[PDB]
């Protein structure tokens, strides 16, 4: 629709290598970033997508906002393949990342793919949701594969940041059916209701 800044937060933890996708799901997110990159770059004439890995590699940044997909796809193979996922310190990295974008009129949005549930307490997400809500930061949560063995631990994070779909607080639940990876987030209201595909 309009200009926006998209930040993709992947999961490098130990449960990200599971078989939710054929071969290794750790290599599946390579196509997830490519699907969002081709969808957002073709929608607007100027758009950039960032990449932040906060699981097991410490809150580092593989690639920041850029218009080239060469270094983004290459950094996913040599990164840390196993670790512990922490969503409390990972979302704070993308908050300071949005100030480095191209245009200041772009909408602030954070897209995070959560594979396994975090072991940290949910009390930190309460104060974290109120921080992103005051700055009007869109939160996109994709929870898949962790619903079978555990309940969603980010529901309390969404309840505090809860806002109508026209602003922030976008929560998604992917059905564990025999469906392709790029088709799971395609039917979800992510790239839908935009200017062009």
């Amino acid at each position: 629709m309009v200009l926006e800044a998209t930040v993709l937060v992947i999961d490098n933890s130990e449960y990200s290598r599971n078989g939710d996708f054929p071969r290794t799901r750790f290599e599946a997110q390579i196509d997830s970033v490519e699907f969002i990159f081709q969808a957002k770059r073709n929608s607007n004439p100027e758009n950039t997508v960032g990449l932040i890995s906060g699981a097991g590699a410490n809150p580092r940044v593989l690639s920041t906002f850029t218009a080239e997909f060469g270094k983004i796809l290459a950094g996913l193979h040599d990164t840390q393949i196993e670790g512990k996922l922490h969503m409390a310190t990972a979302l704070q990295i993308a908050q300071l990342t949005l100030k480095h974008r191209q245009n200041k009129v772009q909408h602030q949005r954070i897209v995070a793919f959560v594979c396994s549930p975090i072991s940290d307490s949910r009390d930190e997400l309460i104060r974290l949701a109120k921080t992103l809500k005051k700055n009007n930061v869109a939160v996109d949560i994709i929870n898949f594969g962790e619903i079978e063995q555990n309940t969603e631990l980010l529901d309390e994070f969404i309840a505090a940041v809860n806002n109508p779909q026209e602003e922030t607080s976008h929560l998604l639940t992917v059905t564990p059916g025999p469906r392709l990876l790029y088709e799971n987030i395609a039917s979800s209201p992510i790239i839908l209701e935009e200017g062009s595909s």
Partner: protein, 387 residues
Amino acid sequence: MFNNHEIDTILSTLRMEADPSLHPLFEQFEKFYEEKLWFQLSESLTKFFDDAKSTPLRLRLYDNFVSKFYDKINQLSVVKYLLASLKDSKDFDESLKYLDDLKAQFQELDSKKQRNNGSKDHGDGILLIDSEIARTYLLKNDLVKARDLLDDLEKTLDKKDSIPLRITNSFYSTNSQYFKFKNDFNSFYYTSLLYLSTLEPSTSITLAERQQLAYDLSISALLGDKIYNFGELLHHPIMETIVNDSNYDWLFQLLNALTVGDFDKFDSLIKVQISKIPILAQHESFLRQKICLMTLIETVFVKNIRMLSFEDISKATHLPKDNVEHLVMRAISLGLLKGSIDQVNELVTISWVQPRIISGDQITKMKDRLVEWNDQVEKLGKKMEAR
């Protein structure tokens, strides 16, 4: 039981869409052998929390699982088990068959990256099998063929290493068994110190390996004359993790015999089941030579005078003037003291080398000494401003 059937199926359901490694017949086989909660072999993350209860003799089925294990998890996960699991079973025959069929960078390396062998968690079989073979002939055959393949492993670690200490502790475990069968307790003492420092953080922190290590730390501390005598024993919690009896009490008698000097303490400090080793016969007088000498140094020290005489040493060591220059010069040549001994005037000059650990007595004393230096410089500094 059904523990491996129910738990691994739920885990494999996430680890693979359609489980290749789930066989209704193989799941019933694990229940027939081991009916307890602790299973000798498992898959996914269950095998990490469950080790072999008694002995892993049923691992023959674990090797067949590797063929269908690739579609679930990469082969990095099965290298830490098998060859390295058979080491706890004290059987080198069944492990040797898989050592030659794999070796390094033949069957293990095609599309797979380098995890730096098997030290911790997942890994490949490149540098681990070379380390297992070094310990295979070390705990079975002589030490001639063990060091020949150990040098290639030592030069590889020095040339290429990683951030964690997981590789060092696995490397120190190889040298720990190498110097144990030898007659040199000085190199074995320093080897066990590096193995103990890396054992506590990770890599089998359980007390099973610490009981066999503490038995070697007691032998290396009493016989080894290299690093102090009892000084290093107080740094690491060695005696705190073991009992005080069954020939573990001799470590406590080391501090009392060196400080006091009673002859009846040394005779009862080690019995004939140990002291029969000729190494202690030469080191019997080398243990008390350092403590009795360093005790007299701090006693005679006032300001500028560390000088000692023969009568002061002859009372502590109970030896004539001939044995005074023999024992002290040996410790001086090792680099512990810069001083010397004058045989004519019966005077012994000693410099300051030993760092003199176990502090806390002089901290309050040296604090006022720094105030004296701070006052002299301040007074002389103000005089240079006016004049």
